[PDB]
Amino acid sequence: QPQVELFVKAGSDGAKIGNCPFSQRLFMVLWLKGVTFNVTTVDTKRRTETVQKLCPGGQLPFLLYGTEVHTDTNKIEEFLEAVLCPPRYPKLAALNPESNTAGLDIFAKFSAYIKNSNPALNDNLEKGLLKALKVLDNYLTSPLPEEVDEDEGVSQRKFLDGNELTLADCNLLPKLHIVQVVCKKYRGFTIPEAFRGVHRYLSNAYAREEFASTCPDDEEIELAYEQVAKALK
């Protein structure tokens, strides 16, 4: 009911949505809440008077909820999940605490792999990324408490916590998107088909407009990584 406006980082043209997994995460949350909201891209190099008055500190993303400004993605998400409550808006929080931690090291192992310029560490950092993807794949093929005794021993649910998207998917999918896009372009690296749980996860995720329509363009994600990703000769 109070106006909800999400301020995200602008891409290469200073206008369109830029590479930012925290901006896409909140976008996915506001989408799954069913609330009315706008998104305003911010070019950090050419900040409008409006933005400098609203958020003098410069933090992005930030949220205007009515007249109050919220900073820090995790705090913004906690705020949105508490205030947009049933029956008008769905609870998005996962039931199973492990849904919130599965694959949460993937992004850090990716960052080390893609920022690495030492040819001698490429293999090691690849195995590190593969291992973390594997831990996720185990979680995704582990049956959840709701699947209790119902391909014996294998989960076939769609997302981290069940067949509905949760806050947990909102945090992980934007990061997994970047990993896929950036490793294809710059390392000829691809999530092995053997990780059947992870490929089923992503196929369900790309099918849902909440993920697919909140993704920045491949071209933006690749430009954001070109400097660090090419340092590896």
State yes or no: 60 annotated in a binding site. yes
Tell me how far apart the alpha carbons of residues 139 and 134 are, in angstroms, rounded to a whole number: 9
The approach used to solve this structure was X-ray
Listed resolution, Å:
2.5
| Cβ–Cβ < 8 Å for 81, 30 | no
Domains of the chain, with CATH numbers? 4-83 (3.40.30.10), 97-229 (1.20.1050.10)
With b for 16 or more beta-carbon neighbours within 10 A and e for fewer, the 49-72 pattern comes to eebeebbeeeebbbbbbeeebbee
Encoded tokens for 17: 């949505």
Cβ atoms of 88 and 118 within 8 Å: the answer is no
Q: Give how far Cα 108 sits from Cα of 103, 173, 178, 179, 202, Å.
A: 10, 14, 12, 10, 19
Non-local (6+) Cβ contacts of 142 within 8 A are 155
Phi and psi, residue 65, nearest 5°:
-115, 105
10 Å Cβ neighbour count for 231? Answer: 12
Cα separation, 139 vs 118, whole angstroms: 32
Q: Is 32 within 8 Å of 90 (Cβ atoms)?
A: yes
Tokens 């992870």 — which residue?
198
